[PDB]
Amino acid sequence: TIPHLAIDPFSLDFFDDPYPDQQTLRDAGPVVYLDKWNVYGVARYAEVHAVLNDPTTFCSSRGVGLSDFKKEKPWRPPSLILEADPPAHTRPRAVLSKVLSPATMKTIRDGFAAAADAKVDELLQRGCIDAIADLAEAYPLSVFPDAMGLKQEGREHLLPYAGLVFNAFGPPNELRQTAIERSAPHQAYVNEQCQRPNLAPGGFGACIHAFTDTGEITPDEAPLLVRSLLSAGLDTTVNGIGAAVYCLARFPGELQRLRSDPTLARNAFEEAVRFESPVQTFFRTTTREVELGGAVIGEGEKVLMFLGSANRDPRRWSDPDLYDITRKTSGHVGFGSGVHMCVGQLVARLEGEVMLSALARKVAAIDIDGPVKRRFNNTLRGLESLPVKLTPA
Ligand code: HEM
Ligand SMILES: COc1ccc(C(=O)O)cc1OC
Numbered sequence: 001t002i003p004h005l006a007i008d009p010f011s012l013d014f015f016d017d018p019y020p021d022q023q024t025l026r027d028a029g030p031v032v033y034l035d036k037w038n039v040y041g042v043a044r045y046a047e048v049h050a051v052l053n054d055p056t057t058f059c060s061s062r063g064v065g066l067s068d069f070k071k072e073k074p075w076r077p078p079s080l081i082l083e084a085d086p087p088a089h090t091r092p093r094a095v096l097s098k099v100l101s102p103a104t105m106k107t108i109r110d111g112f113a114a115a116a117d118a119k120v121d122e123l124l125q126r127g128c129i130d131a132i133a134d135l136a137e138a139y140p141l142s143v144f145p146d147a148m149g150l151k152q153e154g155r156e157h158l159l160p161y162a163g164l165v166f167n168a169f170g171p172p173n174e175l176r177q178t179a180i181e182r183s184a185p186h187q188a189y190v191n192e193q194c195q196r197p198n199l200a201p202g203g204f205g206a207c208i209h210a211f212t213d214t215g216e217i218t219p220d221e222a223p224l225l226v227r228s229l230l231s232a233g234l235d236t237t238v239n240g241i242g243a244a245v246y247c248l249a250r251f252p253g254e255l256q257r258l259r260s261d262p263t264l265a266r267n268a269f270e271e272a273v274r275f276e277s278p279v280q281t282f283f284r285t286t287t288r289e290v291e292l293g294g295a296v297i298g299e300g301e302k303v304l305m306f307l308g309s310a311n312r313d314p315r316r317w318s319d320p321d322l323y324d325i326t327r328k329t330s331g332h333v334g335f336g337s338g339v340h341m342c343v344g345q346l347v348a349r350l351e352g353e354v355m356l357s358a359l360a361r362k363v364a365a366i367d368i369d370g371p372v373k374r375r376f377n378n379t380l381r382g383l384e385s386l387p388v389k390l391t392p393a
C-alpha cells in the first residue's frame with residue numbers, strides 16, 4: 001500500500017515554506033502517492049539517488065516534467081539531451097561535455113574571476129544593493145551571454161525564457177499556463193540566437209556548431225544543442241549564486257569562516273546548491289514494472305523526484321538544515337546524478353567559486369535590510385529580491 005498525501009508541491013504555500021511538507025513527503029513512506037496530481041513521488045535520498053542512477057528503468061524520453069510525451073504533445077520540440085535516453089542521448093551529451101570541459105573552464109576562468117571582483121568592488125561603492133538584481137542576476141548576465149557568443153540585443157529575454165522552460169516541467173497550474181501563453185517572443189528570440197551566423201567566434205555557441213563540420217552532429221541538431229545551453233545555463237546559476245548569498249546573509253558565522261579561508265569558496269557554493277537546491281524536482285517514467293522503496297510500480301508511470309528533499313534527508317546528512325561550508329557535499333543531488341548529471345556543472349561552479357572568492361576577500365558583513373521577496377516557479381526555487389547591506393573588509 002502506498003500512502004496518499006494531499007500535499008501540492010507545486011502550490012504557492014508549499015513554495016513559500018516547503019520544509020514541513022518535504023519532511024512529511026519523506027516520513028510518510030519511501031514512495032508516496034500525490035492526490036492533487038495523481039502521480040507517485042519519492043522524497044528520500046536513497047530512492048531519489050537510486051532512480052537517477054537507473055535510466056533504463058526510469059527513462060527521460062517520456063519527458064522529465066509531469067507530462068508524458070508518449071501520451072501528450074510536448075509544449076516545445078523535446079531537448080536532444082535532457083529528454084532523451086541512452087543510446088540517443090550519448091552523442092549530444094558528448095558534444096556539450098566537450099564544449100563545457102575542464103580545459104574550456106581554464107581558458108575562461110581569469111575573465112570570469114576579474115568580472116566577479118569588479119562586480120563586488122562596484123557593489124561596495126553603493127553599499128545597499130539588491131543581492132538578486134545586482135549580484136545573483138547581474139553577475140551571470142555579465143559573463144555567460146558573452147561566453148556563449150550571444151549578441152547584445154534581446155538578452156533581456158534570457159531569464160524569462162528559462163523561467164518558462166522551468167515552469168513548463170510542472171503540472172498544468174496557473175504558473176505553467178500563464179508562462180506558455182506568454183512564450184512566443186522569448187522563443188522567437190532564442191530560436192534566432194541558436195543559428196550559426198548569430199553566435200560569435202570562440203564562444204560556446206560557435207564551438208557547438210563546429211561539431212557539424214566533422215559530422216559529429218547535423219546542421220539541424222546544432223541549433224537544438226545551443227537551445228539547451230540557453231534554456232539551462234543562466235537561471236540555474238542565478239539561483240545557485242542567490243542561494244549562496246542568502247545562506248551567507250543568514251549564517252554570519254559561516255561567512256566569517258569563509259573570510260578566514262577563502263579556498264572554501266568552491267565548497268561554500270556546493271553546499272549552497274545542496275542547501276537550497278535551486279532545481280527542486282524532476283520526473284522520470286517507468287519503462288517496466290519495478291519495485292521501488294518496497295512498492296511495486298507498473299510500467300508507464302511518472303515518478304516525481306524531490307531533489308531538494310533528498311538533499312535535506314536526515315537519513316543521508318548530519319544536521320541537514322544547517323549551512324556548513326566544510327560539509328562533505330559529495331553525493332548531493334542538486335546537479336542530478338548519473339548519465340544526465342548536470343553537463344554545465346563546471347560553469348556553474350566556476351561562477352559560484354569566483355563570486356564567493358570575491359566576497360571572501362572583499363566583504364566583511366552581509367546584512368539583510370528590507371523585505372525579502374520569493375519568486376515562485378514550478379521547478380526553480382529562489383528569490384526575486386534580497387536587499388542587503390554589504391560592509392567592506
Ligand atoms: C547551480 C546551477 C545549476 C544547477 C542547480 C543545475 C541542475 C541540473 C540538474 C538537476 C540536472 C539533471 C537533469 C535530469 O537528471 O533530468 C541538470 C542537467 C543539465 N544541466 Fe544543469 N544545473 C546548473 C547549471 C547549469 C549550467 C551553467 C548549464 C550550461 C551552461 C547547465 C546545463 C545542463 C544541461 C544541458 C543538462 C542536461 C544534461 C543531460 O541530460 O545529460 N546547467 N542540471
Ligand atoms: C537542468 O535544466 C535543464 C537542463 C537541460 C535543458 C535542455 O533544454 O536541454 C533544460 C533545462 O531546464 C530549463
Ligand SMILES: [Cl-]
Pocket residue numbers: 076187190
Ligand atoms: Cl523553445
